[PDB]
Design a protein around this ligand. Sequence first.
Ligand SMILES: [Cl-]
Length: 129
Amino acid sequence: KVFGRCELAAAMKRHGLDNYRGYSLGNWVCAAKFESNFNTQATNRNTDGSTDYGILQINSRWWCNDGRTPGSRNLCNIPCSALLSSDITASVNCAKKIVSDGNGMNAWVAWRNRCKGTDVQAWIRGCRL
Ligand SMILES: [Cl-]
């Protein structure tokens, strides 16, 4: 499913991401726009052989199992296919583990390069939250 901007902001707020580890809701909406264009079914393969899955492009070397990433760790305890669901619960629960890992939202390259330090409140402007 391809979310609208405000529909996803509302879904993230309901699942407890607003201000999670100090990151306001606009940071999570901005990271989803540039990682996946708000599409839960987005996949992209990396040069190391790992693949990124879903709305927040969570990687199979560390976080989920896809059966084709040798020596990888499955820290979230989920098949990577669960991250492609229309229901974002598994992606949000695993994103909370990633953002707590020490480097905060700098784990998301698109957030560091396109959201960090910008007016991220713009991403939630106009929405009924
Ligand atoms: Cl980037």
